[model samples]
Target: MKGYIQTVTGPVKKADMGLTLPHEHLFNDLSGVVDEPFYEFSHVLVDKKVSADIQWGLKYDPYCCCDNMDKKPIEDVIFELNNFKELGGKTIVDATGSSSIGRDIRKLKQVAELTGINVVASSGLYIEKFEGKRLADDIDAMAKMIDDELNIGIDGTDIRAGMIGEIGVSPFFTDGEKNSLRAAALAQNNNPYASMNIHMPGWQRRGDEVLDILLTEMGCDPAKISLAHSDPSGKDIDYQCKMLDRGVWLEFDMIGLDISFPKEGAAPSVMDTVEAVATLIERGYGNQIVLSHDVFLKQMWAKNGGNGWGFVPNVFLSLLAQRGIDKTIIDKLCIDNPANLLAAENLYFQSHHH
Candidate 1:
């Protein structure tokens, strides 16, 4: 039966989801160095002595690494939450997709409780690099894991994940990547309303092939899938428009990572993202768009001297207004779209008779 959006507290009515940030991370620890519990700027640097993968290493480059250095304290997170609340934000979808990179459901619950903001948790394996042997090898197990997290509780807690993704995949799907997508599709097939958010690797233009696997091949509903990190390809208007026309959601999610590096073209600057979105809105694609900072690192927070979560409310909304994008369209992108996507619908669960 159709019902409300599943939050840390429980189901919330769709009307109550005001000013939602469809993608953002309140906490994350993606640094590959195993010793640290959270991301630290000091450890992630490529050893000067060892040859580095420039493509991979640049994400942790010293200059930009400032954004990722700090591990957020609950108090610090609460402060950001208050900032968001002050700006009229009500909900945030934290895309911490895996335990390897640190998905803390308990912390998420605590933050939601203390701040009174609706928080939706997620399940499903991330990119191939993070998915250990079991997840990499077994498609059925991956599907079962996601299904169980949705139906059961994540990591055996009572806190069931409300969504199925931010399922991370690379530019090209590996066998494991294909398996993860298939598994996520299977989970969403059963729980149709728990929308899937695909985390596409940066600067890649494989949206068509990825969509084929998710929509045509997997038979997942196009409306229930969101293609994330898509704004980097903003110059490719035909590609962006094509995906939007297919009825899936597109997230220009990285709002504040403005610095550019070598070989990656330029990471879209803030105005770059806004201009792309503005053009899409002009072309009648406003309803299909959503925006977020996707801020996982500590430096991204305002308290840490970064744009913080409030960038969307404090700056981006005003930029949209200045761009002459209609207020209704802005509201739709910020509020209505997220409410529709996050709300649980058509879920069929058998009563357990244990």
Candidate 2:
């Protein structure tokens, strides 16, 4: 293969990375920081064992539950990865971007080695960054920090990251999140082929504010930027078109998530994404869109009643075909789009060679 991508193990040929899930989390710890008391019913159930009787709730509103957001068992995650593999998957971008979010690179490397999946790692910050951390203070420092991860090893290991984000930014777009976005853009600016994506706030704003910072202020390639959590704007064709018009990738990562507690801007259904995809494709924005399941919880695993990682390859592609999206276009979404973004170059050393 002429082009290559950074995998947890090492560099992997781009052609070798078959069907890819570009936005997913193998493991995470989001219990402490994020808490929303949406359901009064889920109050007393914090840290509950998720016993067989109540296990079904995992599919619905696991957001209020602490155990679901906790780091899952090793075999549990491995089994999920195997599910995707058995269902014709080859690569998964572990968009566990921030060290603040407990993104264990070694953990990912081990999982990849065990399951024989090409796990592409990330190098950027999420919204919930630590106050005293070295990366939180300066934008240039933040940019260089991720640039080093793209160029060198992460956390002092030889395991390098392949992408720039899942950069977290709330709709409020605080200086903290804004700078993180800027740094991510700068990092992408440093490496021409870097695969960068963002977890935009659930405001359904078409990523305009985020784009202004990255595209206008920071001056990164829109092709390198992907707006995750596009599920909120799932059915908003007008919003989707405007963002697509900006040349950034709008990722419908919450493909099969059935959230019972639908907030103001929460992603509604897989069908909404379908219609949006159909409409957007009709308007000729197919190449700029990508697909993934942003699974960050224990309940989202197959053994626990969720779709598991294979939902896209196993279930979603069929749905797109059912909608008359055509198999060729599906290939572009599942295979070619991810591969094109991920087939990045470690151009930092090449250009800055002293």
Candidate 3:
């Protein structure tokens, strides 16, 4: 817990993590994210190319976001990330919690310079079984860390983080998830503009339960937080709609992983997200939705023969076009809503609105 403080850079200001790729990991420890000790603890080496295929769909090379990611020199990662800029990805949020590792601030800085994309990282401990311990036993310590990260920087380093997640809570989270929820409540309460992205606890009301906890017990400004991965709940459309009606941002950030489990149908497709948005918007919560793929991890998918080696932002856009969900809605989800959530605190709305 001592060195768990975050590092910061730039102003404590981010207008939407700009073109935000919410809920994605660039590179992470296999054991940390999934909590498989045998796979993680054992010295296993896998092909980076194959891993890229499953993580970002790099084989078909739609966006050319080739991840030659290694835990070596940060300079090399900068070189590779510049390639992302050439292909035109504006920003990315590294959702690697404390346990998942592989968060290279220097590499991200180089990529920002090379590609002009604002790269933001998160500050919460991961929900995986292996992620050491909680950052705090209570909300007070969590808020102190969050406030410091937002205003000063993390761990007294020059490199600062811009966002608060991918803070997670899976269905199997045990007691750690409960602590995560309490931390989230205090965080939203303290930082008005701060946006917390939940990894949506499985395909049940786990998402709804998390939402209720935040909106009710945590008393977070429902409008300021985004309930990510709502599509996984598979609940009736109206159930998700109610959350939107309550003024929470509904994010289906894992946009393209649906094909990986077609037989099992675990991941929700673009159409499912489109329908959720359309239905919510029709019910007048249109402005409260966001979209992205929980993708870009090279290491996590390497063991499983990789997953999304081709799907990227533009591919999702094509599907949206086919679904008749115009660019305006897409822009709102991608830009406006996120900006509002990020700026809500700085604007002093939480004090009055909540």
Index of the highest-lDDT prediction: 2
Output the lDDT of residue 244, model 3. 71
lDDT of 3 by residue, 142-231 (tens): 656655655555555666666676666766755666677677567656655566777665466665677678777777777667776676
lDDT of each: 0.75, 0.77, 0.55
Any runs in candidate 3 off by more than 4 Å, and if so which? Answer: 1-9, 12-18, 31-88, 99-101, 258-265, 299-312, 346-354
Q: Write the per-residue lDDT of candidate 2 for residues 187-218, one digit (tens) a residue.
A: 78777567788888755473888888877887
Query: What's the TM-score of every candidate structure?
Result: 0.87, 0.91, 0.74
Displacement of the residue 304 alpha carbon in candidate 3, Å: 14
Q: Runs in model 2 with CA error above 4 Å? A: 34-38, 51-61, 128-136, 261-265, 344-354
lDDT of 1 at 62: 29
**What would the TM-score be for candidate 3 when compared with the true structure?**
0.74
Q: What is the lDDT of candidate 1?
A: 0.75
